[PDB]
């Protein structure tokens, strides 16, 4: 499946320029919104927005381009069609068969932060790692009851390589007998994950 | 601003002086690929995507030309207003949980990069380590600054204190983030 790109229009007659086309999908492709943005030194000066239907100046720099691009039917029609030829095409194709089908499973390991001593305070970490995609539920239990006091998780940590990571700490005191279980739920899992640590 | 998924097709970036360019595709935060402007091929971050999808790199190379023009036009049109340099911020963290003697990977997340010219290097006990360094490309932020992650593969031990050296015009002296 081949991917198409948004086509930068040509400007009319250290410094940083950036141009991007962005595709905003809601409920698959039942709602698609399309924005292209032209940025010069962290300031966006023109913009196509499919809700609006035509390039509009965001700043004073942007009037020349917007008024002209809108005047050429070959230019304007090219940009409007990018909602179908870039956004919808891509999602129905490339994305549907790659990222949208990606399911990488959580690696769940429990750890005690300081050597065990019954009737003494320690902290248990449940490292949940190498997963995709991001929607993940991670809860702690002592003996079957959800423990919410003394629990702290990291925010979702984006690894940068199409995997995510989250670390959930529990504060506790191991009594003799008790069972602590990390309870993980993730779309790549048939049934949830429970990992136990016998005190 | 509000959706389920956000694909950003066709992100192009161009800078002056020096004539630097980056062309990439992202989806839900992650880089699908970048076009190598010198080797003129599409480099997929996940190999297994490349075997199932594809992209004519000329699409990138053309876009970069357009931008190169537009930057040139826009420089003149604003009486050459230059970029305010920002101070960037490092964050080191392991990719896996640390187990002594088992090979892992250390990740340096560098954010608020602007402009996207940055030297990011690794120290181990204050000496240059480059064992299996992979750098990602500049990712875009909603405020038009950039982030970028380095990677260092290492064997964890006790006798190792690792640093993350980051150099940039927005920093008087180079900032080190210890781990």
């Amino acid at each position, epitope marked *: 499946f*081949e991917a198409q790109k948004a086509k930068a229009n040509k400007a009319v007659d250290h410094f940083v320029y950036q141009f991007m086309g962005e595709c905003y999908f809601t409920n698959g492709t039942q709602r698609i919104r399309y924005v292209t943005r032209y940025i010069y030194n962290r300031e966006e000066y023109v913009r196509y927005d499919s809700d609006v239907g035509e390039h509009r100046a965001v700043t004073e720099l942007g009037r020349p381009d917007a008024e002209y691009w809108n005047s050429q039917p070959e230019i304007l029609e*090219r940009t409007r069609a990018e909602l179908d030829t870039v956004c919808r095409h891509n999602y129905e194709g490339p994305e549907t068969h790659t990222s949208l089908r990606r399911l990488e499973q959580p690696n769940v390991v429990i750890s005690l932060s300081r050597t065990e001593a019954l009737n003494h305070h320690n902290t248990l970490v449940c490292s949940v790692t190498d997963f995709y995609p991001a929607k993940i539920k991670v809860r702690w239990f002592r003996n079957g009851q959800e423990e919410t006091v003394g629990v702290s998780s990291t925010q979702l940590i984006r690894n940068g390589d199409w995997t995510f990571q989250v670390l959930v700490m529990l504060e506790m005191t191991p009594r003799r007998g008790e069972v602590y279980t990390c309870h993980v739920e993730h779309p790549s899992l048939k049934s949830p994950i429970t990992v136990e640590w016998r005190a | 601003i509000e959706a389920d998924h956000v694909g950003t097709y066709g992100i192009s970036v161009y800078q002056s002086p020096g004539d630097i360019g980056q062309y990439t595709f992202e989806f839900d935060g992650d880089e699908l690929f970048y076009v190598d402007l010198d080797k003129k091929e599409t480099v997929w971050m996940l190999p297994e995507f490349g075997q199932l999808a594809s992209f004519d790199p000329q*699409g990138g190379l*053309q876009n970069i*030309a*357009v931008v190169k023009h537009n930057l040139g036009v826009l420089t003149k049109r604003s009486n050459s207003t230059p970029a305010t340099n920002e101070a960037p911020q490092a964050t080191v963290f392991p990719k896996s949980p640390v187990l002594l003697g088992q090979p892992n990977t250390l990740i340096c997340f560098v954010d608020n990069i602007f402009p996207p010219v940055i030297n990011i290097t690794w120290l181990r006990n204050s000496k240059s380590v480059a064992d299996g360094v992979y750098e990602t490309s500049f990712f875009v932020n909603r405020d038009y600054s950039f982030h970028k992650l380095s990677y260092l593969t290492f064997i964890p031990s006790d006798d190792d204190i690792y640093d993350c050296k980051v150099e940039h015009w927005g920093l008087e002296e180079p900032v080190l983030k210890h781990w």
Partner: T-cell receptor
Amino acid sequence: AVTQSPRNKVAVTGGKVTLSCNQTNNHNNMYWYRQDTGHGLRLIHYSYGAGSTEKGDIPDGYKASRPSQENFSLILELATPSQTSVYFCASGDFWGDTLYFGAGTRLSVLE
Amino acid sequence: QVRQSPQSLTVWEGETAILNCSYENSAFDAFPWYQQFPGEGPALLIAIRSVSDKKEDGRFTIFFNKREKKLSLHITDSQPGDSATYFCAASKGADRLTFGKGTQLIIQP
């Protein structure tokens, strides 16, 4: 307008032939084709701006060069007989629906 | 690859000339025809995008057919001065064009 020079050239083998094309349209892209009976219009090299070039479908034997927005040259360093042909320049806008061709250059590379 | 047929075609004046063309790559979406008179360079004549099954300008029309990946240029009431070589190109996402071998057309008086 798109003007090529020379319009006709006779070169010997191993000889250097440089076809050049000028372009009044302020078009950003330029292209170099060759025409032959049995092959059609085949894209040799092309370009998006001064200082850049791109391989076309039959770039072997030819070296391109675009020193200007206006002008795009095609250089034949070691001219071989198989390069006897009719050469066409073209230009257009970024993503342009339309190409604008020059008149042509009849080139004979003889033995 | 883009393929036209025949290599050469001969039609009586006034009859309709049918010039066939077909393409491999289904990713293509733009199909301009160029017209080349002897001694001149080829020049855009008429064109179609693939979202459409027909484009009609004057005596020249293109009939397009995405499912069969086949393409067609009709010239009605042909005149002697319509005789030239006719190229079929294809474009994909607005990148460079790929032309076919070209069809010669002679209009007999």
